[PDB]
Amino acid sequence: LIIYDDLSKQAVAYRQISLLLRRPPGREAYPGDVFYLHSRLLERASRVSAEYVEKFTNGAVTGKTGSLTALPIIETQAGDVSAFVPTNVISITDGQIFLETSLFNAGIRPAVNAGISVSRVGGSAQTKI
């Protein structure tokens, strides 16, 4: 299981690096291949099959399935979800959990917005009960 404290800072650092290096600027003063930057990383989290484990381990271990989980974090300004970057990251992951300032200051903690937060795996990732 892996956790990224904030990927917005990584995006800012990448924009810096790709601007100090001469590369044409783009929408929102950001550069090209930001979607590729944030997608080549997240897609590395996967659940491999027992055949893959057996082939990688050269027969040392059998009948086992690997896994890897990710929980990246992205911050927003003025509490909007329709911003270009937040949506570009939402389109990559298998869900999102949205935390609202209006709920936080109202005493609702943890502030989770039921309507705008979804999970794409669903009941498959649960116990029977």
Binding site: R22, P24, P25, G26, R27, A29
Partner: peptide, 10 residues
């Protein structure tokens, strides 16, 4: 401003 910056970069 964005358009002028982009046209200057190329």
């Amino acid at each position: 401003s964005e358009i002028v910056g982009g046209a200057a970069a190329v």
